[PDB]
Design a binder for this molecule. Structure first.
Ligand SMILES: CCCCCCCCCCCCC/C=C/[C@H](O)[C@H](N)CO
Ligand SMILES: CCCCCCCCCCCCC/C=C/[C@H](O)[C@H](N)CO
Ligand SMILES: *[C@@H]1O[C@H](CO)[C@@H](O)[C@H](O)[C@H]1NC(C)=O
Ligand SMILES: *[C@@H]1O[C@H](CO)[C@@H](O)[C@H](O)[C@H]1NC(C)=O
Ligand SMILES: *[C@@H]1O[C@H](CO)[C@@H](O)[C@H](O)[C@H]1NC(C)=O
Lengths: 44, 293, 246, 191, 272, 246, 272, 44, 48
């Protein structure tokens, strides 16, 4: 099982590299400045 | 018209081929001792079984079928695509591709989906055409463009329903068409010659059904009646033909009465009445009429 | 201590009584261009007091049969003040924006507004013609409305073929007349190029669409204006030359 | 990310008034408000959200969903609403005393004008197919029904017709698998 | 994270002050109310994978991109068959790619060539990529087909389909499918703004193809372009289009005859 | 942080905006039966997820000439759901209850409601006859109203000969339409026996009586419903046998 | 254990109390009486292997699974040829696989395509796998044949037969060939229970195939499906069927005309 | 002799792995609770 | 099939020819009055 081997001098001619599991969801779900707590009223 | 039932159970035709263009011949009903449907088992009719090779329906199937010769490739029986076998109120089967449907309207899915439940679902919302496919579908709509995907064969759309097992509910990706006026309870009829079915015609008629079918022709001389299909197993429920001018009864037919197949009456305001009971229900009627100007 | 806020940029201030939390678009603050991502060689100018301030546009009366309004933000401040003058003389431009939409009413009015920003908000022509010479295209006053603004014809599709329902992925805020009377969005510079001309390219655009219609009983006030204030935060300009209008 | 559900997708409606749930003052003590299916890969209100299209690009989904309601009436108008989720089984509940046996939340109209009914994962298997039609009713999810808890009371000199905006998103245990083609576009004009 | 999310065991609460189900939607944020702050849940160790939902596994599909006809007649002949490299010709990959604003990726173009009636006769073809600015070949026997300082592929019809890898070659830092501006300065008209939305950062040259022979070859070929995206990065997610496409470089839709995003129902107080 | 509350029991949740403090009846939490006070030998069952949840009853329109309504709580959930099914099959029963009464109105309506619980709320017959054969006694639909409910005839005497004024000793809560829109009471198991049949004995009963009448000006809404939600906390069942209805 | 079993040297016994040949069969257990507790045996070091009798070496056979006809006419043409993926069409692999209740494995589907008269002409075919829920292609020139977000194989007739590997994709934890239940709720009839035994956990989509050309190709192809099981695990062993099969999804047998499990003899007191 | 080498990132596309010689026959032959001895009467 | 929902014991006729059904104490209160008649049916025990 080895698909990280390239056959050319150029790097864009390879296959899919190591997968990245990064998942930042808070930049779309809570784009607010005051961090709203989980157990609180959002407005006071 | 040759078939007045939704599955062609009463079709006494002269078709000894499976299809007219691109078909194989049918086998005789007396040379079929191998199969459990032959004339050695069923004398005196029983669906129509003589010394012919016609496309009959003795087993209560969804379409008439004959015996084809086995060519060591499986199929020993084929459905017969009879062009003149369609109840008046059956437009035919059509193709169904995707998100733009042939019938733009309401949709409904159920595990007990017969022909009359879908017709009643499309009728209770004032839609013009019903439609069903794959056994579990009810597509309503009022658009005149329902042949946008092409016309399909009648033998292709013989998938059995889920509520009943003697009716074709379209097929996988193939929708069968029905108008909503079939099986209704009364209606202002102004056509030249149409058919009037009992309430819940594809099913058996319900308990306590009573309605008034009205037929008016703008200037007809006299009207002609007919009785293609009539099956009543009781003497309490009965059909009547009345004239609404002075409100008198013309003729009263019931289960113990064999109606004449054809007669003329010099009226133009005939109204039909059907008083059902709650004891015994077997099947309805298919009264065809004709007005000569 | 959350419903009150005073934003101060330059010599302007915005006080509030009925406010929700401020919205920071994509979690990124608008900053200056770093040397790693920059590509021009000439040194850019940074007034930081003369163009970074709250500019108030006109007010639009929110009626009952209203569809909505929209704007091209690097093109609305193209002629108003020191910012517009400084943007006409320069070829390159890069800044963020701070927004504030005012809409107040009584406690007897009902309604809701959806204010959001759409990067590269492209206006689509309306028609069913596929021939190249008669295919409808929006005019210049429709693509770039200027300081006045433009109205929607089919606000259900955002005038672009994309449904309004799915437009909640953008940096958005609601103005519910029973909850708040303002909405605040801070958006950074969003583009695939470091600098860009602020005359023939609008980066994003505000849109205000009343989802719930304005309703009130006979006897209350009938003029409900829609006011918008914009602060061009962290502005940069490059390529000084003659001043061009459009 | 929450996205406005299209609950009023029925006929006799225009485009903009199609995303609003009408709320009025009923004279009888208990009546039924808008109701809709949970299945996101099914023809209905979920077709208008981003989660529905993303689940349409795939064929099997898992994890819990979230439906967030929002009252956009007047400030002086109060009331309580019952948002009840019911697991698969029989059809839509007829009355409230039947629908209140499942998963429900009492939501009152206060300063905060939004409630978020979570839809838990009560499936027998790990994944559900987005097909859910005819003989695929094995993978149905249930019915969310919004009932009137007390009433929609309104003071004088105040309109007595409000609206509720329904939003929908997915939780953190949301999972997708097996990529396929969507069924929102079947043909296309030569471009 | 290789799995989705685990569930914490929960219980009931009888106390005032804590309201996790009253998340305000006017703030523009998404409700963060979990199941543990609600109906009593259990302990579930979820091991469902999230690898398939990534962007590199979502854009790793070829799809049809371009269809190029080559008649090569005897009396009404042209010889060559150029094809402007654009992705907006077929609405499947266009709908899959126009859900983002800025993208950056590589390509794995593949060419499947068939005959009119369908037949693989051993005819050698020449696939030429003409970069933007290079002269286009005019004729099957032109000077430009020498392919000096120009990449080209020689393959037959009986051979497997050709497949080359293409790097990121836009002069900007990323591609864009929506350009809210104009390509050049000047006065813009009010009648027909046919240059609005045009992005010069996407013109990736022209693709040409001919038949390598001397006299002629009475055969009508039909090439298909299959482009596999790889090493893709997307920014600023955009909603998915709900209207049918009408043009290639313009997102025009029908003003009348609008398509609703959801189909109609019988009543609002009815789930089915 | 006191006016908002989210109660979660099972797979149900109740959110609130206008709330007072929650009421804990007699300062005792509802718990399970200890081994010292118990008397049965067979092991009791505890679903703890299928019967412990919020069940919502019907809504009653609060009119202007309204007297009040009441309920027998171990008899209202006698036929609704897994709790009712599990209570029909068993002979013994012991649980507490969590209540929530919803009644919302605008800021232009006025009125007040008194919701309280009365352990062993015995309905009294109404008449002035002392002969044993004609002395009036309440019917079964009056003593046990079921899931629907029953109305008061003389709510000033609580239909029992005890004045409504002195009924403030019970665990009570007020619903003042200018202050709150809900009331919450948590009551434990109160009985002189450890277990008891939930079919022929109601432990307590809710009563809602409008002390101040509902008033509003011509133009506002007129339908004011009264909704009640009940959570059978810490339920136990014993003596499994055939299912009986009543 | 790499060998079967060795034999211990035994001898005769003359004593009361030890009865190894009186194993009761009423207890439901199998008699554990060995040879060493009986007639005098010897010391044998058995080295016969048991590797071939394992499950992975027993289910590593391809066998015929499906036969798909493709006529591709000119006047009565269809173009495509779909095939529901099921194993119950041929009784050999069905009899080999229905001796267990629950199984879990992978597949190595192989497609051998021949002509009517038998001939390998260089015609390229397209094998498409349609998952359950995806639309089926209707026509040789349909929209679904683009194979965007859909796996497909392009191969010719002169090429070796194609061979792909298929993972375990049932929504349950294992397959099952016997489902004692109903797929949905409702009232079930007494006349014809045509939905009894149906398991929705086995519908593995549909397999389609067409001829990649422009106009037509008057040739009647006939594809054969060969599925090699691998990585297989079985549970709850079930007896082998002794009656001839009659239907595909139903284990129906003949009420009359019963087939005995053993053939008849002359007499019971006769070995031959 | 090496057939344990895979050529893809997926694990189901490999060949037959190392054979398992496990043989538990007592779960089918003697599914009883009281362990019946070899030299004894099964019932007393 | 109705009586087998309570407390029951299957007794087979073997070498030992006696079974002993225990009757547990499933009363609500601590003590039962031996009266058990008419309006005293509150203190009944059950049916074997
Ligand atoms: C040797 C023949 C190679 C054939 C392929 C040509 C190589 C250059 C391909 C560049 C890849 C561009 C992918 C899309 C670019 C732009 O976004 C589109 N033109 C606009 O949609
Ligand atoms: C690219 C073409 C691939 C053709 C093969 C289709 C891939 C999917 C095959 C799934 C393997 C299923 C094996 C048997 C499944 C169920 O048990 C049967 N349908 C019922 O007997
Ligand atoms: C069908 O019947 C007609 C009767 O006119 C006859 O002429 C014809 O030969 C028959 N064909 C077959 C195939 O039996
Ligand atoms: C069946 O009937 C046909 C027509 O009468 C006749 O020609 C044929 O010989 C019959 N076959 C048998 C087996 O009697
Ligand atoms: C009724 O009159 C028509 C004339 O139009 C005739 O054809 C028909 O046979 C008559 N019916 C009877 C029963 O004589």
């Amino acid at each position: 099982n080895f698909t990280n081997i390239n056959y050319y001098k150029d790097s864009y001619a390879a296959s899919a590299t190591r997968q990245d599991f990064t998942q930042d969801p808070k930049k779309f779900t809570q784009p607010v400045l005051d961090s709203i707590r989980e157990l609180s009223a959002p407005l006071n | 018209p040759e078939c007045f039932t939704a599955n062609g159970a009463d079709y006494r035709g002269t078709q000894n081929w499976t299809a007219l263009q691109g078909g194989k011949p049918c086998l005789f009903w007396n040379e079929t001792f191998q199969h459990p449907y032959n004339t050695l088992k069923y004398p005196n009719g029983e669906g129509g079984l003589g010394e012919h090779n016609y496309c009959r329906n003795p087993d209560g199937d969804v379409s008439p079928w004959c015996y084809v010769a086995e060519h060591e490739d499986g199929v020993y029986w084929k459905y017969c695509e009879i062009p003149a076998c369609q109840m008046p109120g059956n437009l035919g089967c059509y193709k169904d591709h995707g998100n733009p449907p042939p019938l733009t309207g309401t949709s409904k899915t159920s595990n007990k989906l017969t022909i009359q439940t879908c017709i009643s679902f499309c009728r209770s919302q004032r839609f013009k055409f019903a439609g069903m496919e794959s056994g579990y579908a009810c597509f309503c709509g009022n658009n005149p463009d329902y042949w946008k995907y092409g016309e399909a064969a009648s033998t292709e759309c013989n998938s059995v329903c889920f509520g009943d097992h003697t009716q074709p509910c379209g097929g996988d990706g193939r929708i069968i068409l029905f108008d909503t006026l079939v099986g209704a309870c009364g209606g202002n009829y102004s056509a030249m010659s149409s058919v009037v079915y009992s309430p819940d015609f594809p099913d058996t008629y319900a308990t306590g059904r009573v309605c008034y079918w009205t037929i008016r022709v703008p200037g007809a001389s006299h009207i002609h009646f007919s009785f293609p299909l009539f099956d009543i197993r009781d003497s309490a429920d009965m059909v009547e033909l009345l004239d609404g001018y002075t409100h008198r009864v013309l003729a009263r037919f019931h289960g113990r009465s064999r109606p004449p197949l054809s007669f003329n009456v010099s009226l133009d305001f005939v109204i039909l009445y059907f008083f059902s009971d709650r004891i015994n229900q077997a099947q309805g009627f298919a009264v065809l009429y004709q007005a000569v100007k | 201590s959350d419903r009150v806020a005073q934003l101060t940029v330059g010599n302007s201030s915005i006080t509030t009584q009925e406010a929700a939390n401020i919205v920071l678009a994509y979690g990124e603050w608008p900053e200056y261009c770093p040397d790693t991502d920059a590509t021009a060689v000439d040194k850019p100018t940074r007034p930081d007091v003369s163009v970074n301030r709250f500019y108030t546009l006109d007010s639009k009366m929110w009626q009952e049969n209203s569809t909505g309004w929209y704007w091209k933000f690097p093109d609305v401040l193209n002629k108003t003040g020191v910012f517009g003058q400084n943007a006409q003389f320069h070829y390159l431009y890069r800044s963020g924006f701070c927004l504030h939409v005012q809409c107040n009413a009584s406690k007897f009015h009902q309604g809701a507004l959806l204010v959001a920003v759409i990067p590269e908000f492209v206006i689509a022509g309306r028609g069913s013609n596929t021939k190249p010479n008669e295919a409808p295209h929006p005019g210049f006053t429709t693509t770039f409305p200027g300081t006045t603004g433009a109205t929607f014809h089919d606000p259900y599709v955002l005038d672009s073929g994309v449904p309004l329902s799915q437009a909640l992925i953008y940096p958005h805020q609601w103005i519910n007349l029973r909850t708040n009377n303002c909405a605040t969005v801070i958006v950074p510079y969003i583009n695939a190029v470091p600098f860009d001309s602020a005359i023939n390219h609008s980066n994003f655009g505000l849109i205000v669409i009343p989802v719930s219609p304005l309703k009130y009983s006979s006897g209350a006030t009938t003029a409900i204006p829609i006011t918008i204030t914009i602060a061009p935060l962290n502005s940069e300009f490059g390529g000084l030359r003659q001043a061009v209008s459009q | 990310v929450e996205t406005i559900l299209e609950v009023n997708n029925t006929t006799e409606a225009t485009g903009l008034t199609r995303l609003l749930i009408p709320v009025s003052s009923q004279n009888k003590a208990d009546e039924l408000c808008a109701a809709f299916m949970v299945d996101p890969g099914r023809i209905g209100p979920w077709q208008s959200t981003l989660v529905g299209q993303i689940c349409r690009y795939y064929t099997q989904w898992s994890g819990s969903l979230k439906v967030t309601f929002m009252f956009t009436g007047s400030f002086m108008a109060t009331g309580k609403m019952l948002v009840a989720y019911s697991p698969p089984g029989s059809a839509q509940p007829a009355n409230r005393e039947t629908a209140m046996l499942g998963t429900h939340v009492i939501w009152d109209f206060g300063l905060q004008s939004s409630v978020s009914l979570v839809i838990p994962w009560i499936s027998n298997t790990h994944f559900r197919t987005a097909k859910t039609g005819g003989n695929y009713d094995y993978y149905t999810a249930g019915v969310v029904t919004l009932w009137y808890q007390t009433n929609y009371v309104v003071p004088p000199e105040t309109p007595g017709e409000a609206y509720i905006i329904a939003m929908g998103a997915a939780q953190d245990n949301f999972t997708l698998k097996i990529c396929k083609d969507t069924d929102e576009v079947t043909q296309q004009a030569v471009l | 994270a290789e799995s989705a999310a685990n569930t914490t065991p929960s219980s009931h609460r009888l106390e005032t002050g804590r309201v996790p189900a009253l998340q305000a939607a006017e703030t523009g944020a998404t409700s963060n109310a979990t199941d543990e702050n609600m109906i009593e849940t259990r302990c579930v160790v979820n091991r469902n994978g999230v690898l398939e939902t990534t962007i590199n596994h979502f854009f790793s599909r070829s799809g049809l991109v371009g269809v190029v006809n080559l008649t090569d007649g005897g009396t009404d002949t042209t010889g060559y068959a150029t094809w402007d490299i654009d992705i907006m010709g077929f609405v499947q990959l266009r709908r899959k790619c126009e859900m983002f604003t800025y993208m950056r990726f590589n390509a794995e173009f593949t060419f499947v060539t068939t005959t009119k009636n369908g037949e693989a006769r051993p005819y050698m073809l020449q696939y030429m990529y003409v970069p933007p600015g290079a002269p286009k070949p005019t004729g099957r026997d032109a000077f430009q087909w020498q392919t000096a300082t120009n990449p080209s592929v020689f393959v037959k019809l009986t051979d497997p389909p050709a497949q080359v890898s293409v790097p990121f070659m836009s002069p900007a830092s990323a591609y864009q499918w929506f350009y809210d501006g104009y390509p050049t300065f000047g006065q813009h008209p009010e009648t027909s703004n046919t240059t609005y939305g045009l992005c010069p950062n996407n013109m990736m040259g022209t693709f040409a193809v001919r038949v390598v022979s001397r006299e002629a070859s009475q055969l009508k070929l039909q090439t298909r372009v299959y482009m596999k995206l790889k090493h893709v990065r997307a920014w600023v997610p955009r909603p998915i289009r709900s209207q049918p496409y009408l043009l290639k470089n313009f997102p025009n839709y029908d003003s009348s005859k609008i398509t609703n995003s959801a189909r109609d129902r019988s009543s609002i107080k009815q789930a089915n």
